[PDB]
């Protein structure tokens, strides 16, 4: 564990691949490998450089589209949503440091073991020192994900994420189905709708309808803070998804969310009771 560290408290896997591919130092190995094993809900954050950062002028990434694709079986590029359905990837870039961040959130449930890599090629970059023209190298990250233990106690209306959520139904032309779930403390829940549907309130779980306060548009932070959540607006498959879990929250909570279209509408209803226990 030289560049990739996994903190258990935050369940965060931070990998730094900058000085390892720096083209200013003589290097004995052209391919530097680092392996990481991840489980449900783990978060992988890789901090890589850009073309603007010095010594990484001709830097590039493989697959060139990180947010969408990965190197499946360390071989052929494949959309990450295909092998890890319900995952969430984000790309950040700090112009002050010329450094980007690839952030991967593993879904709360992984139905099948998955192995895939990500390459960071800096071989094309170079520097000139003394009578030498030093070059960069490439670094490969091999990520393995275990089986995900338990199906999320959430709702799925796309019908595609049946293995991920407890409730799944194939979308119908005209339907007003409403999914009700009872969740406890430190239990996962979520929803899955089609991307072109309207989310109500927008970016749900972060701003849920305050059913106690008569279905009020308010940030969930006001209702509670001992919660963890995530959400993707549209994946490669064209579906919006969100997840939530309460952590040492003593207050009983009831909130809701809605995906609506001109043809049908679907509603998620969740009841957080810390004393509630699954049958």
């Amino acid at each position, epitope marked *: 564990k030289d560049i990739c560290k996994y903190d258990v408290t935050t369940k965060v896997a931070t990998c730094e691949i900058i000085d390892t591919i720096d083209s200013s130092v003589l290097k004995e190995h052209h391919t530097v490998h680092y392996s990481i094993t991840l489980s449900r809900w783990d978060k992988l954050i890789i901090k890589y450089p850009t073309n603007e950062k010095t010594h990484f002028e001709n830097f590039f990434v493989n697959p060139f589209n990180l947010k969408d694709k990965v190197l499946y079986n360390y071989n052929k590029p494949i959309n990450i949503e295909h092998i890890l359905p319900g995952a969430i990837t984000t790309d950040i870039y700090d112009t002050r440091t010329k450094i980007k961040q690839y952030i991967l959130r593993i879904p709360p449930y992984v139905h099948k073991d998955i192995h895939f890599s990500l390459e960071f090629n800096n071989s094309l970059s170079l520097t000139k020192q003394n009578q030498n*023209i030093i070059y960069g190298n490439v670094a490969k990250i091999f990520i393995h994900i275990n089986q995900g233990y338990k199906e999320i106690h959430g709702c799925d209306f796309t019908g595609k994420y049946s293995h991920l959520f407890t409730y799944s139904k194939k979308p119908l032309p005209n339907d007003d189905d409403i999914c009700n779930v009872t969740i406890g403390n430190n239990t996962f829940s979520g929803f899955a709708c089609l991307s072109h549907f309207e989310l109500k309130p927008n970016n749900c779980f972060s701003s849920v309808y305050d059913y106690n306060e008569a279905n009020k548009v308010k940030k969930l932070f006001d209702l509670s803070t001992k919660v963890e959540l995530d959400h993707i607006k549209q994946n490669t498959s064209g579906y919006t998804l969100s997840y939530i879990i309460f952590n040492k929250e003593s207050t009983k909570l009831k909130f809701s969310c809605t995906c609506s279209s001109n043809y049908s509408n679907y509603t998620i209803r969740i009841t957080f009771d810390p004393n509630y226990i699954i049958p």
Partner: nanobody
Amino acid sequence: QVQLQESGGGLVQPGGSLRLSCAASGRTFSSYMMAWFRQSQGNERELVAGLTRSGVSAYYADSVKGRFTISRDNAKNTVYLQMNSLKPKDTAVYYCAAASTTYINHIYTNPSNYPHWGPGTQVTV
């Protein structure tokens, strides 16, 4: 340990192409860094193309940049220098130099830093 041999160079009309090949014997090319060197009549030896031991980091001098391309057939143990759009300045005795280093990502600039050299082949345009 490694002996170099150039081949495939002669007279061409301005605007043509050539493929200079350089074969090694004694040890595999992967264990050596490779470079092509220029030398016109009564002038010093300059570097045109270079190649680290990684085989993927190729350097091209600004003179031949955008027209020359280096390659390494490790099966045939040969380095190929493709030279397209040949211009009157390219007229020189092209040499093939190889050095031995335990680093895979660097290439030397001065011809003195290269212990092993090969008998150059003349390329006139």
